[PDB]
C-alpha cells in the first residue's frame, strides 16, 4: 500500500527508475545511496546496495529501520540455468536458497544456515499481480526457484555442479537470498523481478558486457507497471 | 575508551561474560539479543548474533547505530590451519579475508568482493595491548591471517584446497570477515580474540563436541583482562 522500497546492486540497474521520478531527493549513509520521490502516483525509496551478500544485508537493515516500507521489490540482472530461457526474458521468484552454504557435518540439508529454514518464500499476492502484468505488456516470463552465492558462474564445470545438487533451480545471482533472509528476521513481504543477461557458461563474461543494458530495460519496465497497480 | 561492543555467535560463547556483569539488563530486536551492564569498571554491550555472514552483518549494523561504540571485539571458537597449533591456544587477527568469494572472470583477485579491498586490517594499538596481556596470564597465543566462509571445514580434501590457495592463512571460521566489512563501511576500530576448538580435518566434528567449552574459557579469560586495560 502506502510506502514502496526498491533495491538494485549497480548504477546501470537503478538509473532508469531514478530518471522517471518527479521531485527527486538524495541521502547518504556509509556506502549506501537512497533516492526519495513519486512514481506513477505512489511514494517510493530507491536503494543502490553494492555487490554480494554482506553489502545487500547492510543496505536492507537500514532501509527497513529508517523508512518503514510496507513491501520490498529486488530488480536487476541474472544467469539462466533452464535450457528453455533466452537473453531478455523476465524472472519472478517463488522460493530462494543458497548454493554455497555447507554445515552437513552436523546433519543439516545442503544449502541451509544452522538454525534457519531450508528456503525462504516470496509473497503470493505479489506473484499473482505481477504474472497478470507481464501478459498485458506482452513480455516472455517464468516463475521458479532462484539460488544465490558470493561467486560469478562463468564456466561449464561450475554450472554442471550447481544443476546436479539443485535440479529444480531456474537461474543464479549474488544478492536475492541475503535480502530475503533480512525480510524474514523483521517480518516484511518481499518479491524478486529480474531479467536474463547471460547463460552462465564459458561465454558468460562476453554475453554480460553485451546484454547488461537490455536486461535492465526489461526488468525496469515490469516494476514501473506493477507499482501503478499497488 | 568510553563504550565497548562485544560480539559472539552461539549461547555457549557469550554465557561466561554475561554472568560476570553487575546490574545486567536485556533488550530484543528481530532475532538479536543485547545485554547492557558493567564489567571490570567499564560500560559494555554484549551481542548474540547467530551463525554465518548475513546474521553477523544484521547484528553489527544495529549495534553501531543504536549504541555508538568506540571499539568492537569478536570472541568464540575456530579451526587450526597451522601445524604448530594445539586445542586451547589463543588466536589474535592481523588481517582477514574470504576463502569462498570468486569474481576472477572480471579480473579481480581470488577472495575479493567487486569494488572492495583485497583484505581488511585490524587496529594496531589493540593488537599491541592484547599481546602484552597474553604474556601476563601465561596462555600460549599467535598473531596472523584468519579466513571466513558459509561452510564448516570438516575433511582433509576441504582443508588442502584452502591451504594451496592461501598459503599464509593460520585458522578458519564463519563470521569475522563479515563483521570487519561492516566496521570498514562505518569507520569503527575492530579486533578478533578467539581460541582453537578442532584441527579442521576428518576428526573436526568429534573434536568440536569435546572441546567447545574449553575454547570459550580461554577466549573469555583474555577479553575480561583486556577490557580492564582500556
Curated annotation (Swiss-Prot), chains A, B:
Annotated catalysed reactions: S-adenosyl-L-homocysteine + H2O = S-(5-deoxy-D-ribos-5-yl)-L-homocysteine + adenine; S-methyl-5'-thioadenosine + H2O = 5-(methylsulfanyl)-D-ribose + adenine; 5'-deoxyadenosine + H2O = 5-deoxy-D-ribose + adenine
One Gene Ontology term of the molecular function aspect: adenosylhomocysteine nucleosidase activity
Keywords, ordered alphabetically: Amino-acid biosynthesis, Hydrolase, Methionine biosynthesis
SUPFAM superfamilies assigned: Purine and uridine phosphorylases (SSF53167)
Enzyme class: hydrolase
Binding site for substrate: 79, 153, 174-175
Pfam families on file: PNP_UDP_1
UniProt pathway annotation: Amino-acid biosynthesis; L-methionine biosynthesis via salvage pathway; S-methyl-5-thio-alpha-D-ribose 1-phosphate from S-methyl-5'-thioadenosine (hydrolase route): step 1/2
One cellular component (GO) term of this entry: cytosol
Known EC number: 3.2.2.9
Domain of life: Bacteria
GO terms under biological process: L-methionine salvage from methylthioadenosine; L-methionine salvage from S-adenosylmethionine; nucleoside catabolic process
InterPro entries to which the protein is assigned, alphabetical: MTA_SAH_Nsdase (IPR010049), Nucleoside_phosphorylase_d (IPR000845), Nucleoside_phosphorylase_sf (IPR035994)
Main function: Catalyzes the irreversible cleavage of the glycosidic bond in both 5'-methylthioadenosine (MTA) and S-adenosylhomocysteine (SAH/AdoHcy) to adenine and the corresponding thioribose, 5'-methylthioribose and S-ribosylhomocysteine, respectively. Also cleaves 5'-deoxyadenosine, a toxic by-product of radical S-adenosylmethionine (SAM) enzymes, into 5-deoxyribose and adenine.
Family: Belongs to the PNP/UDP phosphorylase family. MtnN subfamily.
Name this protein carries in UniProt: 5'-methylthioadenosine/S-adenosylhomocysteine nucleosidase
Organism of provenance: Staphylococcus aureus (strain Mu50 / ATCC 700699)
